[PDB]
Amino acid sequence: FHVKSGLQIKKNAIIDDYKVTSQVLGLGINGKVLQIFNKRTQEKFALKMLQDCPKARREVELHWRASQCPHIVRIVDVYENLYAGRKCLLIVMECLDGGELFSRIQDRAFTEREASEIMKSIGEAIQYLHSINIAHRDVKPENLLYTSKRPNAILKLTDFGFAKETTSPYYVAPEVLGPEDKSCDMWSLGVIMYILLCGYPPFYSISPGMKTRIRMGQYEFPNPEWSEVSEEVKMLIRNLLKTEPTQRMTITEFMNHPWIMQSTKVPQTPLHTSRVLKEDKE
Amino acid sequence: FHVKSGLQIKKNAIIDDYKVTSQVLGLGINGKVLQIFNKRTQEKFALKMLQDCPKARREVELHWRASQCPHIVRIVDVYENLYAGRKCLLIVMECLDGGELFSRIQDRGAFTEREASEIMKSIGEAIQYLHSINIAHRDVKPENLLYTSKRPNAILKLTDFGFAKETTSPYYVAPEVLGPEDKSCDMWSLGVIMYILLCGYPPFYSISPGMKTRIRMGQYEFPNPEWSEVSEEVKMLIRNLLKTEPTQRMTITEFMNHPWIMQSTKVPQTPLHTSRVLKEDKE
Amino acid sequence: FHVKSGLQIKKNAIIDDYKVTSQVLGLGINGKVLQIFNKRTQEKFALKMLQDCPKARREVELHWRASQCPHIVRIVDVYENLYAGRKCLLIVMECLDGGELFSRIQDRGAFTEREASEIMKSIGEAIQYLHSINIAHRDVKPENLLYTSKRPNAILKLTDFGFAKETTSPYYVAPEVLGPEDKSCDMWSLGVIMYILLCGYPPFYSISPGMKTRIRMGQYEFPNPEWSEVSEEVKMLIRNLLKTEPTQRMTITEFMNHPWIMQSTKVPQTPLHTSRVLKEDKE
Amino acid sequence: FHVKSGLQIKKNAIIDDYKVTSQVLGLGINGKVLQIFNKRTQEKFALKMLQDCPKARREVELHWRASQCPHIVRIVDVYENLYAGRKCLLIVMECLDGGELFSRIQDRQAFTEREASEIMKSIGEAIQYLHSINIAHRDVKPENLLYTSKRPNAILKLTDFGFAKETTSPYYVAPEVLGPEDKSCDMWSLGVIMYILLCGYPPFYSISPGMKTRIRMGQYEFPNPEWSEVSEEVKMLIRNLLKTEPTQRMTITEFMNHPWIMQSTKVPQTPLHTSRVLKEDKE
Numbered sequence A: 001f002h003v004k005s006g007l008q009i010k011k012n013a014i015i016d017d018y019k020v021t022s023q024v025l026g027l028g029i030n031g032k033v034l035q036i037f038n039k040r041t042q043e044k045f046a047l048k049m050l051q052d053c054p055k056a057r058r059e060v061e062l063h064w065r066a067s068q069c070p071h072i073v074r075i076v077d078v079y080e081n082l083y084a085g086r087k088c089l090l091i092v093m094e095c096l097d098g099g100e101l102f103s104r105i106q107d108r109a110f111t112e113r114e115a116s117e118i119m120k121s122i123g124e125a126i127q128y129l130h131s132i133n134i135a136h137r138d139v140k141p142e143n144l145l146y147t148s149k150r151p152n153a154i155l156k157l158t159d160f161g162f163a164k165e166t167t168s169p170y171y172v173a174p175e176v177l178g179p180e181d182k183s184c185d186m187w188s189l190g191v192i193m194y195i196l197l198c199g200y201p202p203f204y205s206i207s208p209g210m211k212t213r214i215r216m217g218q219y220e221f222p223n224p225e226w227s228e229v230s231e232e233v234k235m236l237i238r239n240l241l242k243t244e245p246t247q248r249m250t251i252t253e254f255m256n257h258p259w260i261m262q263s264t265k266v267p268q269t270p271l272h273t274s275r276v277l278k279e280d281k282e
Numbered sequence B, C: 001f002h003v004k005s006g007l008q009i010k011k012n013a014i015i016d017d018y019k020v021t022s023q024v025l026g027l028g029i030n031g032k033v034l035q036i037f038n039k040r041t042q043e044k045f046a047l048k049m050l051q052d053c054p055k056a057r058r059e060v061e062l063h064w065r066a067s068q069c070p071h072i073v074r075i076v077d078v079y080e081n082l083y084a085g086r087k088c089l090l091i092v093m094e095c096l097d098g099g100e101l102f103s104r105i106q107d108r109g110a111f112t113e114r115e116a117s118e119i120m121k122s123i124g125e126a127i128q129y130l131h132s133i134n135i136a137h138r139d140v141k142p143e144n145l146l147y148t149s150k151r152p153n154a155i156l157k158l159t160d161f162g163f164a165k166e167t168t169s170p171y172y173v174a175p176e177v178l179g180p181e182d183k184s185c186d187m188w189s190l191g192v193i194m195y196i197l198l199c200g201y202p203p204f205y206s207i208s209p210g211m212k213t214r215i216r217m218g219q220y221e222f223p224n225p226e227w228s229e230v231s232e233e234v235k236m237l238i239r240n241l242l243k244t245e246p247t248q249r250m251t252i253t254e255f256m257n258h259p260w261i262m263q264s265t266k267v268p269q270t271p272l273h274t275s276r277v278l279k280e281d282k283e
Numbered sequence D: 001f002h003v004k005s006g007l008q009i010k011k012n013a014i015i016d017d018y019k020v021t022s023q024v025l026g027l028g029i030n031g032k033v034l035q036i037f038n039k040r041t042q043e044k045f046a047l048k049m050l051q052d053c054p055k056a057r058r059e060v061e062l063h064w065r066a067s068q069c070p071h072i073v074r075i076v077d078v079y080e081n082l083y084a085g086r087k088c089l090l091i092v093m094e095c096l097d098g099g100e101l102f103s104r105i106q107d108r109q110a111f112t113e114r115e116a117s118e119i120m121k122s123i124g125e126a127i128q129y130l131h132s133i134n135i136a137h138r139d140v141k142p143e144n145l146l147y148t149s150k151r152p153n154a155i156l157k158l159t160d161f162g163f164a165k166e167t168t169s170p171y172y173v174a175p176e177v178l179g180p181e182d183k184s185c186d187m188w189s190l191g192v193i194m195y196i197l198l199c200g201y202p203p204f205y206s207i208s209p210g211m212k213t214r215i216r217m218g219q220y221e222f223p224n225p226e227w228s229e230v231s232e233e234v235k236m237l238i239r240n241l242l243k244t245e246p247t248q249r250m251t252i253t254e255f256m257n258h259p260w261i262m263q264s265t266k267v268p269q270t271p272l273h274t275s276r277v278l279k280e281d282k283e
Ligand SMILES: c1cc2nc(N[C@H]3CCCNC3)c3c(n2n1)NCC3
Pocket: A025, A026, A027, A028, A029, A033, A046, A073, A093, A094, A095, A096, A097, A142, A143, A145, A158, A159
């Protein structure tokens, strides 16, 4: 009988439990992510502040449900306090110190086997969310951070600000179970896999022409980046980057795919990712 | 000029033409299925009774059209009589005595792949006919697939049109332009039946709101030792039937053209664990 | 900075610029296509006349945008004049003299597969351009595919924008998020044209409400001896074009990336029965 | 009988008349503003490109009507051309080389009150013209106020009609009766600009949902030592422009009749801290 706690929204002042610093960990959509310290344990945590509204409360609740998943940033506690007379919602999460996804890759020969291990970890985050009827709708590398600078660090998905719930006899078809989109997550998965295997997006900028290339579905696997990469892997990208959402690959299908399913037993054929990624163009 | 008869709803008392017994052949959705006897011929027939309403008249009319198909239980005649002052609709069908689909399979204790294919072909012809005349069954499951006789030459036939529904009112005109229509649920059903035929248990067991998830997510397995000896072609066919998204799923025309179905004669006899696994009734 | 001219609707009498003959080049949907001559150059051009309305002005405007594409009949100038007190819209295009698609095929009594591919590639570029600027032709058939001259170097061009319609008003944004749009009918049409090119007859003959069925169902064959020598790759391409469900069907970008099209030069010359089979006019 | 030309939208390729360079004069709302050269005269002009739609055509038309006003950037000619198959709208304007409003003020000596008034008068005449022909700019800010040349006789001109909008379709008839209409936002903007001109910083700094508050509430100060020497008359004029309630706020006609504006010549030269305070860029 495996039961976990419900979400408790703490009403007491956050400063009773945490030392809140002004150190900005990262600027983002909903605001500044601040570094804070647990008074009793002295561990570092991240703090995200939002104006308290039902939409805000809905997202936090989804993230809370999601926090059980190993590859989703864990919400440790949530407060509802009063800041400047405005009713605010303070969200405390595990501090991910290992940096963004692509930042780690460029700071080192990058193997294919390691790309697969990354894609498998990102996919488990989507699989969990989709299996509990949650669509992230903002899966991009800015929202994939490592827990520590350590090389055993686990990769974790963050920012549930666009997250949305997808819903309120053995022959009943999926359609009959009810109307639902989460295909955009899988599109995002395809873009991320593309950049991981090569080092640049499949749709660059010019800009109203980039809107076309997406709508049309026109992208290439140009050499010398892609020459050494298998037809199997290119096929997987192609099924992720399907223009029509109903044609596109589902998360269950993705995770069952050999390249993902066998992250252990997969070629180490070097990639140009680390090199190509190095082009900052400041 | 091949013309068949229109549906005639007989107003005369059914007891003039048939001896109606109280022997219950099977309890079902719309009620009890009774065994009856043709007075003039003395043959056994099944009788289904429904309250007479336009919805009822519509289903019967669909079944009647369908009754020309070899693998759909045949409606022999239809009566509209008065029972208890309520206006009733009495449907008389060919009587199927050979038992449900899986029942026959478990009572031969070795089941071959070739024979599963022949079954799926026969079930598919029933769906092909229905779909080809714009009818969606929407209740294709083993309970509604019965054999004509206990004989081993028995032909398998589809029954229960209670959820049946009609799907409708220059050589370059596309399918979409011909009109707006779903019948993909019949193909999902076909996939589930094929899964159970090849192994002996559903692809989605019960835990229960988690089973709703496994269907919506499309997660199922081909676990050994049941599926080990079954080909990648067959698994692929199930995989195309059990597509979560209806527009992605296989159509009936595609299914019937697939080699495993199209060549039911020239297909391996590789034994299946179906009969064994099916034997677990768990009373 | 590659900029081309905007559409200018000339208000001056067309007779000032052109000698308009009474020779009918072809009868069609929106009217007769008349042969005309540029006074100053003495070149042959085709003239299409429509009643001037915003629907007419919109189509013309699309054809104008499309006229930059090599495989789309070029609009040379457009006039708005008064004819019989009714306000008319006179469209002048390049005169295509080489005849319809299948006419040129049968007048060479030995048609190779490689040549079919080069045709499909040319037709596909016309669709690719249109779809890439959010235009859907919705009337792609051989009647509207004509050659520029009787010359064998003639280029094939798409015509008749009377049913043309516009399909519209952060690197991770999905195509669905860019906005709601159909142009899959153009790809179906492409599949039908390809079928006839490789064999000599449609994939859906007539009988007539049965032909409506065969389309809606997706039932067509690759019968021998027409198709025996044709590869599985090519049949597979037709099969993806003739998908009943529009969302399953092949997109133009996908079509043009397909090796048979992409490698129109490095493709077998395996003879086709097209020229022979096509010859049966049955007058 | 003082009549001016209507707007002619030229269809010919802009490159026929102008040499379009790749030099970006400024990045903006609707796109990059490129420098171009008139082939026949060799003068420098600015080019703004927009996607051609009725909304785009509406704004351009307003700007065209407005271009007669001395203090509004002058549209010299407009083209409708085809760029990349997309139908575009190319707008050619007089080129303003003198830089933005505040840029000039800092690059100098002290800044006098008399000069601020002359600026406010020039900006007010732009609003007065627009409002008198029922146009509301809705984007009057310093970024959109540029000088014609680096010369100190340069005239200040309003730009960017991307948010511009038309405010409309017996001597005792009240203004309300003439019809329903907002252009008070242009006057609020005028108040903010005047505040910054007299001191060197906005009246609403950032602290961000709290800056939304300070605006909604209407809370701002005239702090010393910036405002100490500035008269009660000038402060009062700001207070009438910065009225929270739009119906309470000053109209353009009232603004221009106000003595500080009306007597830009006969007004104190009391030095301002603007030039000093503005110098704080904080890179
Ligand atoms: C939990 C959440 C979080 N978000 C972070 N930064 C966010 C900012 C908004 C977009 N995604 C990245 C950072 C973190 N953490 N830790 N640690 C270092 C920077």
